[PDB]
Amino acid sequence: GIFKPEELRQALMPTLEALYRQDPESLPFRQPVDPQLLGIPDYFDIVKSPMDLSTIKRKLDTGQYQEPWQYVDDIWLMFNNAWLYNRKTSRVYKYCSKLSEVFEQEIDPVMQSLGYCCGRKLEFSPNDTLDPELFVECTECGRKMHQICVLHHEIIWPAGFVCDGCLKKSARTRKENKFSAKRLPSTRLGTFLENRVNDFLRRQNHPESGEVTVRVVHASDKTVEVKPGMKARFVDSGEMAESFPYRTKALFAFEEIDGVDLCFFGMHVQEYGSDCPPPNQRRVYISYLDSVHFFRPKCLRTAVYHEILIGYLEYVKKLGYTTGHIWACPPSEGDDYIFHCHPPDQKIPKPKRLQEWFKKMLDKAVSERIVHDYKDIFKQATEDRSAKELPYFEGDFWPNVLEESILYATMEKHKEVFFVIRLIAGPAANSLPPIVDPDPLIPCDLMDGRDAFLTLARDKHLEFSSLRRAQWSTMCMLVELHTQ
Numbered sequence: 001g002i003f004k005p006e007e008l009r010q011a012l013m014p015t016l017e018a019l020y021r022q023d024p025e026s027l028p029f030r031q032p033v034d035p036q037l038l039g040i041p042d043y044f045d046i047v048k049s050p051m052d053l054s055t056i057k058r059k060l061d062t063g064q065y066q067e068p069w070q071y072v073d074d075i076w077l078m079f080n081n082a083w084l085y086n087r088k089t090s091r092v093y094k095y096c097s098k099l100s101e102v103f104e105q106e107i108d109p110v111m112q113s114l115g116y117c118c119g120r121k122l123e124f125s126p127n128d129t130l131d132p133e134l135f136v137e138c139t140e141c142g143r144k145m146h147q148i149c150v151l152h153h154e155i156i157w158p159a160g161f162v163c164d165g166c167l168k169k170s171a172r173t174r175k176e177n178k179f180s181a182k183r184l185p186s187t188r189l190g191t192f193l194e195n196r197v198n199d200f201l202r203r204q205n206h207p208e209s210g211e212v213t214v215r216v217v218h219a220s221d222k223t224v225e226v227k228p229g230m231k232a233r234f235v236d237s238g239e240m241a242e243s244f245p246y247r248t249k250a251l252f253a254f255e256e257i258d259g260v261d262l263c264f265f266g267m268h269v270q271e272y273g274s275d276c277p278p279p280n281q282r283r284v285y286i287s288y289l290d291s292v293h294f295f296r297p298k299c300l301r302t303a304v305y306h307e308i309l310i311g312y313l314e315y316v317k318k319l320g321y322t323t324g325h326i327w328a329c330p331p332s333e334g335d336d337y338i339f340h341c342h343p344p345d346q347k348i349p350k351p352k353r354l355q356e357w358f359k360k361m362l363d364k365a366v367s368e369r370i371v372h373d374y375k376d377i378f379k380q381a382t383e384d385r386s387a388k389e390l391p392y393f394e395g396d397f398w399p400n401v402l403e404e405s406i407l408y409a410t411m412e413k414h415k416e417v418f419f420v421i422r423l424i425a426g427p428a429a430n431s432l433p434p435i436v437d438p439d440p441l442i443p444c445d446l447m448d449g450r451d452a453f454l455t456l457a458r459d460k461h462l463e464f465s466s467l468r469r470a471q472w473s474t475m476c477m478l479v480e481l482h483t484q
């Protein structure tokens with residue numbers, strides 16, 4: 001036992017009286033449902049565990065609740081029975097919804113006064129059913145708390161969870177989390193980007209901004225093989241190379257928010273080096289860009305994205321990559337992209353908004369004299385003067401759509417989607433030294449393309465749907481990156 005029974009009764013009884021005072025919303029909930037009297041004989045075929053305010057009052061008054069979550073569980077059983085049995089458009093359904101809003105406001109401050117994370121009944125995002133959020137138990141006081149509220153990971157703290165209350169009471173502080181973003185192995189690329197971001201943020205000197213970390217978490221050597229269609233026409237003759245080698249890299253940016261890691265940006269790139277045959281030579285392809293919109297302050301979010309993306313273009317330019325490519329079309333309605341379960345209010349941008357966003361960033365990159373020029377693939381193709389000449393990237397649009405044929409008219413209708421970004425133009429691009437990546441390979445199967453991370457996130461309910469859930473998913477993804 002944690003609580004003297006009378007203490008639990010005095011704390012919780014006012015939240016029950018708050019529901020009882022709601023008239024008419026509590027009237028269907030004050031007494032056990034009597035299916036005969038109400039003419040609803042199928043009630044007990046649908047509702048296996050009836051619950052009502054008078055039963056909860058008796059359990060409270062007789063000391064039947066040993067800890068407050070058993071009370072919260074009975075309140076939500078009552079709400080869920082009503083939402084299950086009654087139609088969404090029915091009076092009882094709407095009364096139930098109103099009572100659940102009254103309960104959430106009342107129970108929050110009570111559960112926090114009793115030393116709990118919150119008083120919320122929490123379930124994951126959407127076989128008609130939702131998975132419940134997990135609890136951990138303080139080894140010192142025995143209070144149960146949301147795993148995600150207190151960010152307790154068994155790998156980081158194997159001896160068990162100790163709540164803030166028990167740590168203060170014993171003049172102790174939580175053992176440092178060494179599975180941090182900052183402690184991921186550093187790369188030259190990562191250091192360059194993060195130094196750019198933090199320099200900008202220090203110039204703004206805004207009180208809300210946290211330190212940013214940028215880490216390369218995957219680097220491996222791959223090959224894209226030419227598809228059979230285009231292999232027939234161009235490769236089979238010996239006119240075009242059969243496969244193009246590249247380095248695939250994955251990087252993430254993390255911000256300190258409320259003193260813990262938050263992963264807010266993700267990037268996959270394909271890097272076609274100087275020993276890669278034309279027409280891919282000295283080209284970089286940004287496969288996927290994703291974000292979780294919790295960057296603080298929100299007034300500097302776009303500018304921080306600019307520092308990372310303009311920074312990457314500056315870094316590859318200096319090494320001797322001439323051209324950048326971005327496939328600027330949104331993901332399809334149903335595809336998570338990099339981060340599983342975005343906030344519902346982080347809307348996939350419309351094509352026009354996405355194109356305009358990328359245009360503004362590249363204009364900044366022109367002002368800084370990092371980008372020479374940028375145009376749609378149509379103008380750049382006209383200006384370069386066959387289909388053999390098209391840069392051919394793993395998982396890109398053009399290798400797919402060129403199979404549908406087996407070009408000129410197709411580019412014009414999809415011109416605004418494909419940005420070509422000139423980093424090095426003219427004679428400067430003729431007599432460059434070899435491209436030598438000063439960072440080693442980083443083997444990491446989890447970050448080998450975007451699917452392994454999406455699979456882990458689905459399997460373990462690592463959502464980025466709220467700040468608190470994004471903070472847990474960041475902590476979990478960092479433990480996995482640290483223990484490969």
Ligand SMILES: CNC(=O)c1cccc(CNC(=O)[C@H]2CCCN2C(=O)C2(c3ccc(Cl)cc3)CCCC2)c1
Binds near residue numbers: 337
């Ligand atoms: C409810 N919503 C979802 O379920 C959902 C599903 C899938 C994805 C998303 C959110 N993800 C995105 O918008 C991704 C892909 C398209 C670009 N993008 C970004 O994060 C960046 C961006 C550019 C421009 C603008 Cl205007 C907004 C953002 C950040 C800077 C570079 C790219 C949400």
Ligand SMILES: [Zn+2]
Binds near residue numbers: 118120149
């Ligand atoms: Zn909680």
Ligand SMILES: [Zn+2]
Binds near residue numbers: 138164
């Ligand atoms: Zn405790």
